[PDB]
Amino acid sequence: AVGIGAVFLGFLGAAGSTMGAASMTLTVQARNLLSTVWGIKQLQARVLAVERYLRDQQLLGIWGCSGKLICCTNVPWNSSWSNRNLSEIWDNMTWLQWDKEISNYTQIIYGLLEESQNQQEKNEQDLLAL
Amino acid sequence: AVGIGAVFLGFLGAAGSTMGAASMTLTVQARNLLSTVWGIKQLQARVLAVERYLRDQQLLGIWGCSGKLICCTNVPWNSSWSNRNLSEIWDNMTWLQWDKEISNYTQIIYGLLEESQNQQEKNEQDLLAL
Amino acid sequence: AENLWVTVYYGVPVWKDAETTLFCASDHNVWATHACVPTDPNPQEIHLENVTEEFNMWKNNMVEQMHTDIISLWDQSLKPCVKLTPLCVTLQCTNVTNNITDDMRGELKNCSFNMTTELRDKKQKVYSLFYRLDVVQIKEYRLINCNTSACTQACPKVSFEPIPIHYCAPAGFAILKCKDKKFNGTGPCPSVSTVQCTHGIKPVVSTQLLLNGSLAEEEVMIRSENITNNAKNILVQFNTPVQINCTRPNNNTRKSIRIGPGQAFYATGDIIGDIRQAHCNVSKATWNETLGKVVKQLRKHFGNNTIIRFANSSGGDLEVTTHSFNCGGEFFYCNTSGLFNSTWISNSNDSITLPCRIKQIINMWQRIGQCMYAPPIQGVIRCVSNITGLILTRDGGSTNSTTETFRPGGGDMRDNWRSELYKYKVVKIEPLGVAPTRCKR
Amino acid sequence: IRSENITNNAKNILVQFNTPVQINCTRPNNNTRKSIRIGPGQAFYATG
Ligand SMILES: *[C@@H]1O[C@H](CO)[C@@H](O[C@@H]2O[C@H](CO)[C@@H](O[C@@H]3O[C@H](CO)[C@@H](O)[C@H](O[C@H]4O[C@H](CO)[C@@H](O)[C@H](O)[C@@H]4O[C@H]4O[C@H](CO)[C@@H](O)[C@H](O)[C@@H]4O)[C@@H]3O)[C@H](O)[C@H]2NC(C)=O)[C@H](O)[C@H]1NC(C)=O
Ligand SMILES: *[C@@H]1O[C@H](CO)[C@@H](O[C@@H]2O[C@H](CO)[C@@H](O[C@@H]3O[C@H](CO)[C@@H](O)[C@H](O)[C@@H]3O)[C@H](O)[C@H]2NC(C)=O)[C@H](O)[C@H]1NC(C)=O
Ligand SMILES: *[C@@H]1O[C@H](CO)[C@@H](O[C@@H]2O[C@H](CO)[C@@H](O[C@@H]3O[C@H](CO)[C@@H](O)[C@H](O)[C@@H]3O)[C@H](O)[C@H]2NC(C)=O)[C@H](O)[C@H]1NC(C)=O
Ligand SMILES: *[C@@H]1O[C@H](CO)[C@@H](O[C@@H]2O[C@H](CO)[C@@H](O)[C@H](O)[C@H]2NC(C)=O)[C@H](O)[C@H]1NC(C)=O
Ligand SMILES: *[C@@H]1O[C@H](CO)[C@@H](O[C@@H]2O[C@H](CO)[C@@H](O)[C@H](O)[C@H]2NC(C)=O)[C@H](O)[C@H]1NC(C)=O
Ligand SMILES: *[C@@H]1O[C@H](CO)[C@@H](O[C@@H]2O[C@H](CO)[C@@H](O)[C@H](O)[C@H]2NC(C)=O)[C@H](O)[C@H]1NC(C)=O
Ligand SMILES: *[C@@H]1O[C@H](CO)[C@@H](O[C@@H]2O[C@H](CO)[C@@H](O)[C@H](O)[C@H]2NC(C)=O)[C@H](O)[C@H]1NC(C)=O
Ligand SMILES: *[C@@H]1O[C@H](CO)[C@@H](O[C@@H]2O[C@H](CO)[C@@H](O)[C@H](O)[C@H]2NC(C)=O)[C@H](O)[C@H]1NC(C)=O
Ligand SMILES: *[C@@H]1O[C@H](CO)[C@@H](O[C@@H]2O[C@H](CO)[C@@H](O)[C@H](O)[C@H]2NC(C)=O)[C@H](O)[C@H]1NC(C)=O
Ligand SMILES: *[C@@H]1O[C@H](CO)[C@@H](O[C@@H]2O[C@H](CO)[C@@H](O)[C@H](O)[C@H]2NC(C)=O)[C@H](O)[C@H]1NC(C)=O
Ligand SMILES: *[C@@H]1O[C@H](CO)[C@@H](O[C@@H]2O[C@H](CO)[C@@H](O)[C@H](O)[C@H]2NC(C)=O)[C@H](O)[C@H]1NC(C)=O
Ligand SMILES: *[C@@H]1O[C@H](CO)[C@@H](O[C@@H]2O[C@H](CO)[C@@H](O)[C@H](O)[C@H]2NC(C)=O)[C@H](O)[C@H]1NC(C)=O
Ligand SMILES: *[C@@H]1O[C@H](CO)[C@@H](O[C@@H]2O[C@H](CO)[C@@H](O)[C@H](O)[C@H]2NC(C)=O)[C@H](O)[C@H]1NC(C)=O
Ligand SMILES: *[C@@H]1O[C@H](CO)[C@@H](O)[C@H](O)[C@H]1NC(C)=O
Ligand SMILES: *[C@@H]1O[C@H](CO)[C@@H](O)[C@H](O)[C@H]1NC(C)=O
Ligand SMILES: *[C@@H]1O[C@H](CO)[C@@H](O)[C@H](O)[C@H]1NC(C)=O
Ligand SMILES: *[C@@H]1O[C@H](CO)[C@@H](O)[C@H](O)[C@H]1NC(C)=O
Ligand SMILES: *[C@@H]1O[C@H](CO)[C@@H](O)[C@H](O)[C@H]1NC(C)=O
Ligand SMILES: *[C@@H]1O[C@H](CO)[C@@H](O)[C@H](O)[C@H]1NC(C)=O
């Protein structure tokens, strides 16, 4: 128990790791998104960062995943987007490769999530009406 | 099935529609609230917009309606605010007309919502204490 | 059968190439550290394993940002200083011939003139020693800049010494550093780390030679955007430094002349003792060994039986035709002709002395209409520096001949910054991700 | 025709036409310009 070292994966350390292993350290990435002429540029950069953070949070809230890092949904996975099974995704791939593969099927999923969440909200209101 | 146009109600397109119909497109409006001397004014405008958005989100959160677009509450509807029935509100009126009508009974409703949510939180804590 | 559903993750380790504005970090100077943040005493580096990135030193925006920031700082430093508007007068000059050698004949002019005083109804008669490069004949002369623009005098308290500067990125961005040795600035880097910000970079201004820089850890490195094209400069990074000793030996004197209410002009009074040329020294054996290494590395790209020649500069302005630098406030322009003069064929204590000149009216950056008058420095001056690289250009290059001739180059200061920021790049994080998963809300 | 208060004579009247009316005008003198250096990097342009 003496002569042993302890090291933790820091910030982007899990970039090269698989998706399943990289999904266990989302908090370290999440915490780092927030934190005369030159002052103008610095303040513009700060405002842009704040705006990007607020945009991402607004999208998450609109999809109904507010306040969650992992939030599984009701939208089924169309096979046209991808054909690979879970064995070859969560244990034989990384997030960068997945982003490169799926970069052209992103907006339609967002619209589907928005419409689905609107439908769930309407149904919840109707249920609570009774 | 050829020679047919598809047009979607855009941004404030539902401004003239009834309340019930206008309540089906809240997301398009919600998404649009966020997005040397002249740079100062532009940055001031951006900061003011961000502050307004954060104020509205805080007001929503304090009432227990965080992360929801249609959130129902527990406060009963005092008849002194408006005597009209649901038939003559949600099918024969518009949001602008309703805002003009109830523009003088707004703050008291906010205070009632705040106190009700505080009482609900206290009761939930007491329930969980057991 | 798949029954998979979209699931959202926030905080995924994904990034994209992006451009932003970095800010200071540093531990009276022209490079003002007052408006620059303090640096962390213990910088942190995170080595990313299995991450191979793409790098291109010739498309880095950090170089442009550094150039703009350096120019802005230089402009800012000169604002609260005296403007030498009244100095455009008719000077009457005479040759200086007191204890001069055979190579300093005609370089110095003893010029008398009339000047204003604190009271606007009085005049005084004064004299000063000017350099031949500063005065143009109109026995009557005028300053070289008088028909272009009036221009200011550097305040005598600010120091020109470079200070290290670190560049740290904003929130939501990251700086990736390529730790792969032998990396020639373009292509894939298997070995990468993440840094909060870069090592201290001294903004050293020089031409034809890179001074007080960083050294390759393994061997001499040759870099070029397109080595087949002769219109692109070649950056050579040495493995070991070559010491160079420069000196101005004249015992100068400084005097102050009051040209108005709270405004002084610093003139060269007289020279004590003998008058001799300023010069630089570089060791001969070390230079020969360095050139041997350089030609050995050059043979890799230009054939194994090719004859490699080093020749003189082509021509142009004095700034680009000579190794120009600043040694303790005095601006030297020196003739690097004994260095790049030799031919190489495939198969003790003396030193090379470069004699060279000094100037006082300076157009630092490639601009017209703004000078900078350098006040004289009092006494003898000497300095020593490390040569750690070269900027070369290949002349001609046609297939007719099998001899390759390389000549010194320079002028553009972006090449000086490029040699330091070659292994860094900036990216922006993309924390939103979507994957298949077997729940359902 | 637009006016804030057409009864009040102190308010201007804005008239907007339905079609445009073309107007052509010229200075026909063949002028000449010369430069006079009044200082270091300062020129004054005069009619020669
Ligand atoms: C590459 O790096 C090397 C070293 O890393 C550089 O060489 C060093 O250069 C500096 C600056 O020239 C030099 O420090 C000077 O040493 C002089 C001799 O000891 C000092 O006299 C001088 O102090 C004066 O200047 C300061 C501002 O720089 C003032 O703050 C100070 O008060 C002094 O000024 C007084 O004296 C002058 C002259 O009499 C007078 O006019 C003033 O009014 C005032 O009264 C500096 O401390 C180092 O000694 C050098 N190092 C070595 C080993 O020689 C080299 O320059 C770099 N190369 C390039 C290209 O930048
Ligand atoms: C960088 O990539 C390398 C491989 O390219 C990663 O090493 C690999 O790590 C996995 C899991 O840690 C190893 O899988 C293991 O295999 C053994 C034998 O099949 C099995 O018994 C275990 O249960 C596990 O599945 C894999 O063997 C190993 N590869 C090699 C060549 O050793 C490395 O982890 C990556 N870096 C980071 C930071 O993730
Ligand atoms: C702008 O206003 C007009 C009317 O003020 C809207 O048109 C109205 O639309 C409603 C529903 O779309 C129609 O209701 C219909 O009423 C008849 C009555 O017999 C009923 O049989 C139908 O089943 C239906 O409920 C209403 O008639 C119609 N008004 C007119 C004059 O035709 C219009 O929709 C508004 N614009 C927008 C963008 O909302
Ligand atoms: C530059 O010229 C001035 C003026 O001719 C010289 O100053 C004179 O020096 C002599 C002695 O050498 C004195 O007797 C005079 O009184 C000085 N004149 C003034 C106006 O002070 C000066 O010595 C010359 N400098 C050099 C380097 O030749
Ligand atoms: C400084 O000004 C004086 C006069 O204010 C100059 O002396 C005159 O020089 C001109 C020649 O250009 C003669 O025609 C005058 O007769 C002189 N007047 C006097 C009173 O001496 C003097 O030359 C100026 N100094 C310099 C260095 O130009
Ligand atoms: C010229 O190069 C030599 C050798 O690289 C420098 O001496 C080194 O200075 C560093 C200071 O960071 C020390 O850590 C090394 O141990 C030194 N090496 C040797 C062999 O002495 C020298 O400082 C350089 N000169 C200048 C002006 O930069
Ligand atoms: C590097 O430079 C060479 C020389 O310009 C490029 O090759 C030339 O390409 C042009 C393009 O039209 C041709 O007209 C020339 O005939 C080519 N010359 C030779 C000697 O091949 C070359 O393409 C450049 N490299 C890259 C990557 O662009
Ligand atoms: C550059 O080299 C020359 C010799 O080539 C040096 O000149 C010698 O300088 C020393 C100084 O200590 C004198 O003692 C010698 O008498 C000089 N010899 C000759 C022939 O001039 C010169 O000092 C060197 N300069 C620098 C800055 O290193
Ligand atoms: C440049 O200057 C340095 C320091 O003045 C010289 O290094 C000295 O060289 C002498 C003679 O070999 C030694 O006695 C000293 O011990 C050295 N001092 C240091 C600090 O190294 C160097 O030789 C000069 N180089 C050239 C080319 O002139
Ligand atoms: C590089 O070397 C050549 C060859 O000596 C230099 O050309 C000389 O230029 C001077 C002008 O100052 C002439 O007087 C000589 O006659 C030229 N030499 C020959 C052999 O004709 C050239 O100037 C050198 N490069 C630089 C930048 O000075
Ligand atoms: C740079 O140095 C070289 C070598 O001294 C100069 O070339 C000499 O120029 C003179 C002209 O004054 C000739 O008389 C010599 O014959 C030249 N030397 C050789 C070996 O050819 C060159 O002129 C210098 N650069 C400049 C711009 O003057
Ligand atoms: C338009 O202008 C007329 C003329 O000023 C206004 O009528 C006048 O109102 C003042 C207000 O005290 C009276 O003193 C005048 O006697 C009135 N004159 C006439 C001729 O009626 C009229 O009020 C203005 N319109 C509006 C809408 O304010
Ligand atoms: C304005 O109208 C006058 C006529 O009233 C023009 O004068 C004629 O200009 C033409 C130019 O081609 C000449 O050929 C005629 O000889 C002129 N006639 C007279 C009586 O002057 C004048 O050119 C017009 N100007 C513009 C700018 O349209
Ligand atoms: C000054 O000396 C130079 C070089 O010897 C010469 O060309 C010039 O004519 C001289 N001027 C004089 C004596 O006025
Ligand atoms: C100033 O004079 C020099 C030499 O007389 C000349 O080369 C230069 O072109 C002149 N500048 C301008 C702006 O005319
Ligand atoms: C050197 O640069 C060239 C430029 O095209 C590139 O192809 C090559 O891969 C680089 N060398 C290494 C070892 O990366
Ligand atoms: C330069 O001259 C001054 C004044 O005479 C003297 O004090 C100083 O020692 C001289 N410097 C040298 C290097 O001789
Ligand atoms: C250039 O090199 C040649 C060797 O052929 C030599 O004779 C000549 O003196 C050199 N020139 C200089 C300026 O060193
Ligand atoms: C004005 O004069 C110039 C110079 O004589 C001539 O070239 C030009 O044609 C003239 N313009 C007209 C409109 O006559």
mmCIF file of C-alpha atoms in Angstrom, chain C residues 227-414:
data_model
loop_
_atom_site.group_PDB
_atom_site.id
_atom_site.type_symbol
_atom_site.label_atom_id
_atom_site.label_comp_id
_atom_site.label_asym_id
_atom_site.label_seq_id
_atom_site.Cartn_x
_atom_site.Cartn_y
_atom_site.Cartn_z
ATOM 1 C CA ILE C 227 9.721 22.697 -51.329
ATOM 2 C CA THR C 228 9.436 22.205 -55.102
ATOM 3 C CA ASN C 229 8.320 25.838 -55.523
ATOM 4 C CA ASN C 230 11.215 28.305 -55.387
ATOM 5 C CA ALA C 231 8.949 31.233 -54.410
ATOM 6 C CA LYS C 232 8.399 29.825 -50.886
ATOM 7 C CA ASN C 233 10.884 30.462 -48.096
ATOM 8 C CA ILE C 234 12.650 27.615 -46.283
ATOM 9 C CA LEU C 235 12.789 27.654 -42.478
ATOM 10 C CA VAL C 236 15.848 25.896 -41.027
ATOM 11 C CA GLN C 237 15.926 25.084 -37.302
ATOM 12 C CA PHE C 238 19.311 24.228 -35.805
ATOM 13 C CA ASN C 239 20.007 21.406 -33.367
ATOM 14 C CA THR C 240 22.584 23.439 -31.401
ATOM 15 C CA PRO C 241 23.031 27.219 -31.114
ATOM 16 C CA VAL C 242 25.833 29.298 -32.628
ATOM 17 C CA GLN C 243 27.096 32.133 -30.442
ATOM 18 C CA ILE C 244 27.434 35.606 -31.984
ATOM 19 C CA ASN C 245 28.999 38.633 -30.256
ATOM 20 C CA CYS C 246 28.077 42.119 -31.512
ATOM 21 C CA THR C 247 29.437 45.463 -30.336
ATOM 22 C CA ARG C 248 29.412 49.208 -30.928
ATOM 23 C CA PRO C 249 32.713 50.469 -29.423
ATOM 24 C CA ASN C 250 32.293 54.251 -29.709
ATOM 25 C CA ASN C 251 32.015 56.061 -26.366
ATOM 26 C CA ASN C 252 28.969 58.119 -27.273
ATOM 27 C CA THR C 253 27.692 61.149 -25.361
ATOM 28 C CA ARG C 254 24.094 62.335 -24.974
ATOM 29 C CA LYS C 255 22.830 65.877 -24.417
ATOM 30 C CA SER C 256 19.336 67.314 -23.986
ATOM 31 C CA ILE C 257 17.961 70.319 -25.887
ATOM 32 C CA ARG C 258 14.720 71.910 -24.682
ATOM 33 C CA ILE C 259 12.572 72.465 -27.787
ATOM 34 C CA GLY C 260 9.431 73.641 -25.983
ATOM 35 C CA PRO C 261 7.453 73.543 -22.737
ATOM 36 C CA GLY C 262 8.273 70.136 -21.284
ATOM 37 C CA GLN C 263 9.756 68.772 -24.524
ATOM 38 C CA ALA C 264 13.352 67.610 -24.970
ATOM 39 C CA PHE C 265 15.390 66.339 -27.916
ATOM 40 C CA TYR C 266 18.293 63.983 -27.189
ATOM 41 C CA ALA C 267 21.280 64.706 -29.439
ATOM 42 C CA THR C 268 24.690 63.075 -29.769
ATOM 43 C CA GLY C 269 27.117 65.538 -28.220
ATOM 44 C CA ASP C 270 30.589 64.187 -29.026
ATOM 45 C CA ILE C 271 32.565 60.939 -29.207
ATOM 46 C CA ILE C 272 35.351 60.388 -26.663
ATOM 47 C CA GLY C 273 38.555 58.823 -27.968
ATOM 48 C CA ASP C 274 38.724 57.017 -31.310
ATOM 49 C CA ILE C 275 35.937 56.332 -33.812
ATOM 50 C CA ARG C 276 35.613 52.762 -35.092
ATOM 51 C CA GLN C 277 33.064 50.564 -36.829
ATOM 52 C CA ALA C 278 30.600 48.414 -34.933
ATOM 53 C CA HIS C 279 30.860 44.741 -35.801
ATOM 54 C CA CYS C 280 29.855 41.177 -34.962
ATOM 55 C CA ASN C 281 31.905 38.002 -34.503
ATOM 56 C CA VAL C 282 30.918 34.368 -35.052
ATOM 57 C CA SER C 283 33.088 31.280 -34.631
ATOM 58 C CA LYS C 284 34.379 29.716 -37.852
ATOM 59 C CA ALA C 285 34.546 26.008 -36.973
ATOM 60 C CA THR C 286 31.081 26.055 -35.394
ATOM 61 C CA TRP C 287 29.612 27.775 -38.456
ATOM 62 C CA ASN C 288 31.293 25.266 -40.776
ATOM 63 C CA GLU C 289 29.918 22.347 -38.745
ATOM 64 C CA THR C 290 26.430 23.876 -38.725
ATOM 65 C CA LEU C 291 26.529 24.393 -42.494
ATOM 66 C CA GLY C 292 27.701 20.799 -42.899
ATOM 67 C CA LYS C 293 24.667 19.602 -40.960
ATOM 68 C CA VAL C 294 22.398 21.916 -42.967
ATOM 69 C CA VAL C 295 23.694 20.696 -46.337
ATOM 70 C CA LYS C 296 23.460 17.078 -45.160
ATOM 71 C CA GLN C 297 19.786 17.618 -44.333
ATOM 72 C CA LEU C 298 19.188 19.561 -47.565
ATOM 73 C CA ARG C 299 20.539 16.657 -49.631
ATOM 74 C CA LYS C 300 17.553 14.584 -48.471
ATOM 75 C CA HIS C 301 15.082 16.611 -50.562
ATOM 76 C CA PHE C 302 17.342 17.781 -53.429
ATOM 77 C CA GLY C 303 19.160 14.569 -54.358
ATOM 78 C CA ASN C 304 22.281 12.852 -53.054
ATOM 79 C CA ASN C 305 24.708 13.976 -55.807
ATOM 80 C CA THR C 306 23.613 17.627 -56.060
ATOM 81 C CA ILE C 307 26.053 20.496 -55.501
ATOM 82 C CA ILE C 308 24.797 22.865 -52.788
ATOM 83 C CA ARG C 309 25.855 26.522 -52.955
ATOM 84 C CA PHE C 310 25.496 29.342 -50.421
ATOM 85 C CA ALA C 311 25.707 32.841 -51.919
ATOM 86 C CA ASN C 312 24.941 36.474 -51.115
ATOM 87 C CA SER C 313 21.567 38.190 -50.928
ATOM 88 C CA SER C 314 19.972 39.381 -54.159
ATOM 89 C CA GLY C 315 19.103 42.982 -53.326
ATOM 90 C CA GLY C 316 16.449 45.427 -52.229
ATOM 91 C CA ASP C 317 15.968 47.499 -49.093
ATOM 92 C CA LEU C 318 18.627 47.615 -46.391
ATOM 93 C CA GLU C 319 16.250 45.821 -44.010
ATOM 94 C CA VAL C 320 15.947 42.748 -46.253
ATOM 95 C CA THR C 321 19.454 42.859 -47.778
ATOM 96 C CA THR C 322 21.135 42.778 -44.338
ATOM 97 C CA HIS C 323 20.755 41.029 -40.993
ATOM 98 C CA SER C 324 18.926 43.781 -39.098
ATOM 99 C CA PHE C 325 18.450 43.648 -35.330
ATOM 100 C CA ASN C 326 18.506 45.778 -32.166
ATOM 101 C CA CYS C 327 21.219 45.504 -29.489
ATOM 102 C CA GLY C 328 20.368 47.430 -26.330
ATOM 103 C CA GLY C 329 18.405 50.235 -27.988
ATOM 104 C CA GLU C 330 20.712 50.688 -31.000
ATOM 105 C CA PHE C 331 19.521 49.429 -34.389
ATOM 106 C CA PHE C 332 22.180 47.424 -36.243
ATOM 107 C CA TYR C 333 22.162 46.460 -39.922
ATOM 108 C CA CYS C 334 24.916 43.976 -40.769
ATOM 109 C CA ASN C 335 26.412 42.395 -43.859
ATOM 110 C CA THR C 336 26.119 38.601 -43.645
ATOM 111 C CA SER C 337 28.290 37.986 -46.702
ATOM 112 C CA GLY C 338 31.164 36.035 -45.132
ATOM 113 C CA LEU C 339 28.697 33.453 -43.826
ATOM 114 C CA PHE C 340 26.718 32.475 -46.948
ATOM 115 C CA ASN C 341 29.637 32.183 -49.368
ATOM 116 C CA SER C 342 30.715 28.613 -50.154
ATOM 117 C CA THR C 343 30.052 25.512 -52.253
ATOM 118 C CA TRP C 344 29.604 21.904 -51.102
ATOM 119 C CA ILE C 345 30.090 18.848 -53.327
ATOM 120 C CA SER C 346 28.795 15.343 -52.662
ATOM 121 C CA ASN C 347 31.539 13.032 -51.402
ATOM 122 C CA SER C 348 41.150 26.805 -34.625
ATOM 123 C CA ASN C 349 40.257 30.042 -32.808
ATOM 124 C CA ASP C 350 39.841 32.685 -35.534
ATOM 125 C CA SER C 351 36.328 34.018 -36.116
ATOM 126 C CA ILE C 352 34.383 35.527 -38.995
ATOM 127 C CA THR C 353 33.929 39.277 -38.478
ATOM 128 C CA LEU C 354 30.932 41.070 -39.979
ATOM 129 C CA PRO C 355 31.431 44.875 -40.119
ATOM 130 C CA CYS C 356 28.188 46.775 -39.962
ATOM 131 C CA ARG C 357 26.230 49.979 -39.493
ATOM 132 C CA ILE C 358 23.799 51.663 -37.098
ATOM 133 C CA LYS C 359 20.648 53.678 -37.794
ATOM 134 C CA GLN C 360 18.387 56.057 -35.863
ATOM 135 C CA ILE C 361 15.306 56.639 -38.085
ATOM 136 C CA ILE C 362 13.434 53.331 -38.134
ATOM 137 C CA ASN C 363 10.466 51.950 -40.067
ATOM 138 C CA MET C 364 10.125 48.729 -38.064
ATOM 139 C CA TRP C 365 7.165 47.105 -39.802
ATOM 140 C CA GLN C 366 6.634 47.170 -43.554
ATOM 141 C CA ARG C 367 4.786 50.502 -43.449
ATOM 142 C CA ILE C 368 5.275 53.960 -44.960
ATOM 143 C CA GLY C 369 4.491 57.227 -43.181
ATOM 144 C CA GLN C 370 5.525 56.386 -39.592
ATOM 145 C CA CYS C 371 9.097 56.450 -38.264
ATOM 146 C CA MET C 372 10.639 55.925 -34.858
ATOM 147 C CA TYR C 373 13.608 58.070 -33.812
ATOM 148 C CA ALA C 374 15.891 56.112 -31.477
ATOM 149 C CA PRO C 375 17.681 58.355 -28.947
ATOM 150 C CA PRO C 376 21.417 57.678 -28.652
ATOM 151 C CA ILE C 377 22.748 55.296 -26.008
ATOM 152 C CA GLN C 378 25.555 56.547 -23.771
ATOM 153 C CA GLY C 379 28.831 54.630 -23.750
ATOM 154 C CA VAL C 380 30.098 51.436 -25.335
ATOM 155 C CA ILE C 381 27.566 48.666 -26.022
ATOM 156 C CA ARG C 382 28.089 44.918 -26.392
ATOM 157 C CA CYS C 383 25.741 41.942 -26.638
ATOM 158 C CA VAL C 384 25.848 38.181 -27.196
ATOM 159 C CA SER C 385 23.158 35.982 -28.738
ATOM 160 C CA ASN C 386 22.394 32.471 -29.984
ATOM 161 C CA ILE C 387 21.695 31.742 -33.647
ATOM 162 C CA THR C 388 19.129 28.927 -33.778
ATOM 163 C CA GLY C 389 17.814 29.011 -37.340
ATOM 164 C CA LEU C 390 17.819 30.505 -40.810
ATOM 165 C CA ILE C 391 15.377 31.747 -43.442
ATOM 166 C CA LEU C 392 16.589 30.714 -46.906
ATOM 167 C CA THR C 393 15.367 31.133 -50.476
ATOM 168 C CA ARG C 394 16.211 29.000 -53.510
ATOM 169 C CA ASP C 395 17.052 31.041 -56.605
ATOM 170 C CA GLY C 396 16.212 29.840 -60.098
ATOM 171 C CA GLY C 397 15.983 26.069 -59.779
ATOM 172 C CA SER C 398 15.534 25.142 -63.439
ATOM 173 C CA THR C 399 16.394 21.646 -64.655
ATOM 174 C CA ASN C 400 19.193 22.998 -66.880
ATOM 175 C CA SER C 401 21.786 22.875 -64.076
ATOM 176 C CA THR C 402 22.377 20.388 -61.260
ATOM 177 C CA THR C 403 23.601 23.066 -58.806
ATOM 178 C CA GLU C 404 21.281 24.423 -56.108
ATOM 179 C CA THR C 405 22.067 27.883 -54.720
ATOM 180 C CA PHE C 406 20.444 29.180 -51.526
ATOM 181 C CA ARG C 407 20.474 32.811 -50.391
ATOM 182 C CA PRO C 408 19.369 34.500 -47.149
ATOM 183 C CA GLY C 409 15.866 35.940 -46.982
ATOM 184 C CA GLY C 410 13.445 37.596 -44.574
ATOM 185 C CA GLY C 411 11.539 40.860 -44.265
ATOM 186 C CA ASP C 412 8.131 39.486 -43.298
ATOM 187 C CA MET C 413 7.917 39.048 -39.524
ATOM 188 C CA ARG C 414 5.218 36.358 -39.695
#
